[model samples]
Target: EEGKLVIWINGDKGYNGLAEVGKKFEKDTGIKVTVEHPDKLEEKFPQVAATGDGPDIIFWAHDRFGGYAQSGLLAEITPDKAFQDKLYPFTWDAVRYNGKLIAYPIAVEALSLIYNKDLLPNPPKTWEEIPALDKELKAKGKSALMFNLQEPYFTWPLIAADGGYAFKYENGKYDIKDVGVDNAGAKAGLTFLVDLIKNKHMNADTDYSIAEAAFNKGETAMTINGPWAWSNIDTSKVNYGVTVLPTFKGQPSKPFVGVLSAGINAASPNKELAKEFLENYLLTDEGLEAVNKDKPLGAVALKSYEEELAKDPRIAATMENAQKGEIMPNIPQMSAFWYAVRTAVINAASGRQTVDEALKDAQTNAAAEFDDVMTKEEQIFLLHRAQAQCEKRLKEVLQRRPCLPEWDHILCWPLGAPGEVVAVPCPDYIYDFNHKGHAYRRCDRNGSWELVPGHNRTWANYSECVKFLTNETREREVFDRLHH
Candidate 1:
């Protein structure tokens, strides 16, 4: 109980700032709080949580929350009236999972045009003005705005300006069926980038490391990046200035705004304590003020602190960028979207394929990949693997039944509810979305949920543990399915 409260934070300056908050919380609650900076919290959190050994709290970006929420790994956080009134509306939406809040928003960020003030006396308000500045920069052996052309996150604003979106958002929901990445507007944006590369204004080889180093070394006069890179820039040498992203051919370049947030682990033993610390201390004005003092990563999301945060010119500019941008969707399907779009961007920028061909292929492949997240073939593979794992666990747990030679199928028996052993039959299929009753169901021709084939073969409604096992098994299963 003394060493109970554990928080996993990223190994970065902004998150390290929260170490002070943890100290204060410990003093107030008389509960010891340990803040560990994990190298890769996003990659490691789910696996560690699956084994029921994750920290009580985690600090990270909101975009990755959807995957954890889909797997039932995060606790459903219903904020109090005071808490609800404190946050920005869009910031609240960033941490939501199927309309329920799952985390507390800490800071907001978006890609803004950061320029070397020494080189450009004023920020360019439009894209056409960039080539003129490009010539001036090249006169001094420097390039114009350079960033990772292969990354969809940075380049998405270009497409967004031309009226392209990853998925259609309507009626308070993301319509996965209506992907817009390959639309006419998206092609137009990609074409514009291609022309820039063709004209030698921007480098096709500019990656995250290259772009950052180039800007800091004064090789590039300007760049489009987020505030996360602010601390790394040698401001004394570069004389950087932050401003709202410029328009692309008269259209607004709306960057994908990402929120950094703190979330609770559903498997943590200190649920009540975690909730109390988050609701009472972390979201409070005093708590957030301490965080901001350590040179805030971006603007604080609290409405009460907007005036204070806006006083800082950089923070005000970051907030302005967020206002003109769209919040990045935190849905699990975004995984497929990123993979497809990133590949498309790389191919188009590198001249391996035409913008039209790359985007067209991206749309088709991405949609198909998203649709096949949990296909029948995938499910069949998962069923067999889960059966083996469950059998092994049962053996280690009970010490009564050894490995059975005749154990051929996955038997889904009720763990919490009373039920007989439900034999899982062939052609095993998993549902695409989590829903009530049987989550694993077959889709009818009319797009309604129908019972799985071989009626009466029951599957448990998904839980964290179940989802974890299924995901773990499927990781190898999908690989095997694809290869052999």
Candidate 2:
């Protein structure tokens, strides 16, 4: 450890190989080193950054640069242009925030459509064909797509193919203050999600735990995820295939590449030594190899490490699929975009809403959160319109509505079931059959209703509907149809 450089590396295990290489750096350059980790990494950054005496070098997701740069805590590495030649374009491009080189990326990830080779020996060439492929697999008692509705990483890529973006960026800066949740393309993406659930191509309740378990058990076939799932795959018993996700007719699925890298704190007094350590040993081919082996999330080194990855049969395809990945923004406004897209993706995936509706909500939310162009009331009004638009766009987007086992088979009664003169609950349009079979027009309750026997499964979100329905005093007043 004598005379070695000290760098902070934080993430899950897999980068221990880099520490092994640090020993070699000490042997070669006579620089002692120590790797640092905080009790809570989340609390460490802001506190350390605030102290202006942060670590000389630190490894973290590149998106963190957005906040660090805005906080004036990160050093502008753009002044050190020589280091640019040492990294991959995607990795390098991902960390550059507002014209400054915010980080030196060491890892890169690409998302791909991973399918069970045991189930379908061949993967589909395009996404448009997945629904049919899913049907074929289900007929054989297998699920076509494996997914986690709670996770955005698995669903946002499909939104991109539908021409939806989480946030608009202009001239290398995020339009966070000007969100785009209600954009037309975004709505289209949401509808696509709804269709996926309707067609049974994906499951509505599959969370990370469920999807992980299914994939491990070989119950579900394909899913879109990054290389992080490699270790969990039971390659010994299951044959799995990986391919880039298929795009729309005129577009391709675009996954956001999450890059992780090491950067120096501007306020650290150890700048001279840290820069030398990064330039001399850490960035060297041997150094990158250690990082690759120990912390193998994404491609570690720029050219050499990527070349090594391409030679490996399992990772080559994944790397190839990642070529078009975009760096996610690390700005404060990103929080709104991320959660909005997550909600949209999950809603569409669950069959609760169409992709168009999902994206429209996201765009509307994003715009409201960041742009301030639309008032809160205006956004709400626009969201209702977006939901209506979802109905119109339903026939156009490709989707699979996976039946919610619980919601299935529940009968919707039209006002009353038979000759019993049932007291109308809420005011909704209804039709009745006379002895001659001629239709009789009527108004029925608008919410979940059961003949005087209201003891059915509890309906969530139905309290108001129920209260309004049971309020016989106001029944006629609330029954009128609205022209709008």
Candidate 3:
């Protein structure tokens, strides 16, 4: 075999970091290392893997490890105590599959509560304390807290209190049947968010980028964001502090711990060399620092670097908060949970469903998507079809999309049901317009307003309400338009 090694990565940041790390390893072992950032590596892998010719090493988040290894796309690596002892608890566990390591865990990531010290000198300890501070912030044209309300990845810490989780983890494997997303704890946690929306402490329309942008622009006093977004903050402009998310009912918030790892391709001829590079250079303190030179990651994976990483406040809070975080189930079934909870929270936040209603529906949708409404461990092999099935099923279940009320100049329509026709009396103010007769507006079953056959905008059936007066109608319209 030629003494050249090839690796696939995500983008320029990883490429730049690994290029530096690659040179150091090349200088030592005299092996040329080439890093390629393929735009569609995950998709390209299957096509390339069939020919037994793909990159030797694949660097990605650990969540995909399950699917890659399960599909025989990755080679299993031998367990090493040195690696285990050097990294944090969950960091080591993230790479393990069926008692052996299938990937090398590299970086740690999770959500931590970031607050502006200038506005919020001391972070709140509980969810209850937020409103009181919000009262003060509101007076100063600021909000108490803000975060990505639409993404379950960010919302989990808020809903994970009590006993909420995607799946039950036991004895080194996840119990796919034991989905706990709809448990009583989830209800409590979700309700807490609904109340926050009600009190105007947070915005229901907020998403990841907007929330992070708001924090950076000094619009919000506190936000629950992760390390990836932390690079955007300007420390010079805002005195900021990083800490664990505020406690929920006195129970600590539990964010999903994300581990970025390196794995060897099963079909690769250079599997041995690939593993050596990861073990010797990429996972070391020097390599980790070089990789993170441009942007800081969450807590470093190596336990020995905790103190050194902690000297930076953001990394310190990440290290502390990550200890209380839970590993997101890396199984193929996770997509179902993500879809269900994401829509559920959005539904609950928009007042379309109650906390319990949204959570219950999410659990049901997740169950349906998990494997029937799911399966046992033995049925895991058929997951690719299940993912496609989940999408079809979610589309079917989302048939009842609510249509908001409409306010046309001619008539005001009441809020309509998903597939109902909403009616209201015609305006009395417009001189030629009928006052007593009713006008109709229909909301399609799919949540879109009923539009005219060729027109661009939604159409209202006002024929029943009008008496058909030509000149006076135009005159009244001109007078009303002039006055209004």
Q: Pick the candidate with the highest TM-score.
A: 1
Candidate 2 regions with alpha-carbon error over 4 angstroms: 1-13, 22-44, 47-57, 78-83, 139-141, 169-174, 177-180, 198-201, 234-237, 266-273, 295-301, 312-316, 323-325, 329-332, 347-358, 368-484
Pairs in steric clash, model 1: none
Which ranges of candidate 1 are over 4 A from the true structure? 11-13, 30-32, 36-40, 234-237, 368-484
For model 1, the local distance difference test gives 0.74
Clashing pairs in 3: 367-373, 368-373, 371-374
- TM-score of candidate 2 against the unseen true structure: 0.63
Task: Judging by lDDT against the true structure, name the best candidate.
Answer: 3
- Scored against the true structure, residue 339 in model 3 reaches a CA lDDT of 83
Q: How high is the CA lDDT of each candidate model?
A: 0.74, 0.61, 0.76
lDDT, model 2, position 454: 66
User: Can you write out model 1's per-residue Cα lDDT over 205-323, one digit (the tens) per residue?
Assistant: 88888898888988887888887677778553789999988888788898888898888887787878888888777777777776666546587778777667678888878878888
Tens digit per residue, CA lDDT, model 3, 54-124? 78888776776776766667888864777668777777788876565888887788789999998888999
Models ranked on lDDT = 3, 1, 2
lDDT of 1 at 437: 27
TM-scores of the candidates in the order shown: 0.72, 0.63, 0.66
